[PDB]
Write a protein that binds this ligand. Structure first.
Ligand SMILES: O=P(O)(O)O[C@H]1[C@H](O)[C@@H](OP(=O)(O)O)[C@H](OP(=O)(O)O)[C@@H](OP(=O)(O)O)[C@H]1O
Ligand SMILES: [Au+]
Length: 143
C-alpha cells in the first residue's frame, strides 16, 4: 500500500543478518511475511514463520563447532540450518525455562532444561542475540 514502507521494521546488520522491530500489526505482518517468502533464502526452513532475527553463528559441540544459520521466528522458534548443504539441522527448544546469556561480545549461550547451546558470533553482536531472544521470551511468557 502506498506509504506503508514495511522495510521500516527491518534492521540489517550484514547481507545474511537482520533483526525486526516487534510492534507491527497483524496486517503489516502479512506484508513482512510476503517479503520474506519472496526474498529470504532461508524461508524454506522456518515453517512459514516470520523471521524476527537471523544470522550466522558457530555452534560449539564436542571439541569443535559447526557454522549454522540461526533463525529466531514467531512461535517462537530458534531454527538452525547448515548454510552450505541447505538443510535444517535442528531447533533450540522453547519453553518458559529457556534463558539466553551473553558471556561477551562474541559468545552467547541458550540454556534449556536438558542442554545449554553454546554459540559464537565473530561479528561481535552476541549481546544483540541475547537481547532479542530475551525480548521474545518476555513477549511469549509474560503478559
Ligand atoms: O558435525 P559433527 O562433528 O558430527 O558434530 C555434531 C554437530 O555439532 C551437530 O550439530 P548440527 O546438528 O548443527 O549439525 C550436533 O547436533 P545438534 O544439532 O544437537 O547441536 C551433534 O551433537 P549431538 O547433539 O550430541 O548429536 C554433533 O555431534
Ligand atoms: Au540478554
Amino acid at each position: 500500500p502506498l506509504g506503508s514502507n514495511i522495510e521500516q521494521y527491518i534492521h540489517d546488520l550484514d547481507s545474511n543478518s537482520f533483526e525486526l522491530d516487534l510492534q507491527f500489526s497483524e496486517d503489516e505482518k502479512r506484508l513482512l511475511l510476503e517479503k520474506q517468502a519472496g526474498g529470504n533464502p532461508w524461508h524454506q526452513f522456518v515453517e512459514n514463520n516470520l523471521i524476527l532475527k537471523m544470522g550466522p553463528v558457530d555452534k560449539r559441540k564436542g571439541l569443535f563447532a559447526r557454522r549454522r544459520q540461526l533463525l529466531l521466528t514467531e512461535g517462537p522458534h530458534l531454527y538452525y540450518v547448515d548454510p552450505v548443504n541447505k538443510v535444517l539441522k535442528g531447533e533450540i527448544p522453547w519453553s518458559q525455562e529457556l534463558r539466553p546469556e551473553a558471556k561477551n561480545f562474541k559468545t552467547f549461550f541458550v540454556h534449556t532444561p536438558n542442554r545449554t547451546y553454546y554459540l559464537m558470533d565473530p561479528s561481535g553482536n552476541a549481546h544483540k542475540w541475547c537481547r532479542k531472544i530475551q525480548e521474545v521470551w518476555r513477549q511469549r511468557y509474560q503478559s
